[PDB]
Structure 1
Amino acid sequence: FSEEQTAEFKEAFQLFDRTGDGKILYSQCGDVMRALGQNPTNAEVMKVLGNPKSDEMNLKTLKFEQFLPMMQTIAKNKDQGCFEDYVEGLRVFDKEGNGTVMGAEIRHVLVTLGEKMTEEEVEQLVAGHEDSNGCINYEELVRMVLSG
């Protein structure tokens, strides 16, 4: 990364502290990273954190040359998707095959699959991209997730 954007990252680190000495909680790693032009899966991060459970996930600490290498060690990346991948991967609620997507079910997948979203996380991604019957045009729901 250039020193420029890394300075912005130095701040996005610096802000997020606890005892006042260059110390970020493991928890915050992916989220800060996400804002920093990245969407690293919890599974991706968990690899480069060393499999904590909720306890030491909440308790263990990062510092900047643990954070910034992690950022990088995901950032140069492998599979990360595009429109064509995500129209199929968001035709993912087509109910008959309809070019529009299932309202409750888009919420449920988000609770029910891998990286279990809260109710909160589910509703926010979905809401108001359905119609009266609760059909979501995914062809657009795709671009919404893929840019913003």
Structure 2
Amino acid sequence: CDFSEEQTAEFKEAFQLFDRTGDGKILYSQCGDVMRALGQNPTNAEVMKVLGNPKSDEMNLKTLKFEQFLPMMQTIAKNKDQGCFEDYVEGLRVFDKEGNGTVMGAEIRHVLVTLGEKMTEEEVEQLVAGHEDSNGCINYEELVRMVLSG
């Protein structure tokens, strides 16, 4: 096994934290939420491929047990392809206009809501901890570092 079985107790205890019945079964959406929260930041493609179901169109129908979650994590911990911080730094600087990397927060919100997986504005409103004033500039260094810290 690619993971110590003794540590499975922590995962089993953490699975019993959501506002659900917790009777040894969790829906596909619940599995994805647990993987996004506890497990390493996954992606829709990884969730649909790694023991997933591309043909599935309603995640609220399929259901899995607790033991079925450890193989998913063990496989994602070897098949994942997470990039370094330099890639994200360059991607954020590509949208820079002054060169110093202090563009207003509107640019980050637009890039997160439109380009890519188009996130919801209500979700990014909680992460954007910038200051709103005459300048309203936000730095990419500390922000991206705290975002990728995990």
Q: Same fold (TM over 0.5)?
A: yes
CA distance in 2, matches of 1:92, 1:120: 25
By how many angstroms is 1:62 displaced?
Answer: 1.7
Taking the aligned partners of 2:112 and 2:76, their CA distance within structure 1 comes to 23
Q: Which runs of 5+ in 1 are unaligned?
A: none
In 2 relative to 1, CA 47–142 (structure 1 residues): closer, same or farther, beyond 3 Å?
Answer: same
Query: CA–CA distance in 2 between the matches of 1:66 and 1:142?
Result: 33
Return the offset for 1:52. 5.7
Provide, for residues 107-137 of structure 1, a one-character-per-residue CA deviation record: whole Å limited to 9, x for no partner.
1222113322111222122232676422211
Asked if the contact 1:24–1:62 (Cα under 8 Å) also holds between the matched residues in 2, the reply is: yes
- CA–CA distance in 2 between the matches of 1:20 and 1:134? 45
What is the rounded CA distance, in whole Å, between the counterparts of 1:143 and 1:94 in structure 2?
17
**For the residues of structure 2 that align with 1:58 and 1:100, how far apart are their CA atoms?**
42
Which segment drifts farther, 21-30 or 42-51? 42-51
TM-score, normalised to structure 2, is 0.78
* Alignment equivalent of 1:5, drawn from 1, 7, 21: 7
Change in CA separation of 1:79 and 1:132 when aligned onto 2, cut-off 3 Å: farther
The 3 A distance-change label for structure 1 pair 131 and 40 is farther
Name the CA distance, whole Å, in 2 between partners of 1:53 and 1:120: 29
Cα pair distance change 1:130/1:40, threshold 3 Å: farther
Change in CA separation of 1:104 and 1:56 when aligned onto 2, cut-off 3 Å? same
Q: Is the CA contact 1:101–1:135 (under 8 Å) kept in the aligned structure 2?
A: yes
Contact 1:130 1:137 in 2 (8 A): no
Answer whether contact 1:92 1:101 (CA < 8 A) is retained. no
Unaligned stretches of 5+ residues in structure 2: none
Tell me if structure 1 keeps the 8 A contact 2:103–2:137.
yes
Which piece of structure 1 moves more, 112-121 or 9-18? 9-18
Q: 1:131 to 1:59 in 2, by over 3 A?
A: farther
Q: Is the 8 A contact 2:48 2:54 kept in 1?
A: yes
How many residue pairs were aligned? 148
Give, in whole Å, the separation in 2 of the partners of 1:66 and 1:51: 14
Offset, 1:20: 4.9
CA RMSD of aligned residues (A): 2.8
CA 1:138 to 1:89, structure 2 compared with 1: closer, same or farther past 3 Å? same
> Does the 8 Å contact 2:113/2:121 carry over to 1?
yes
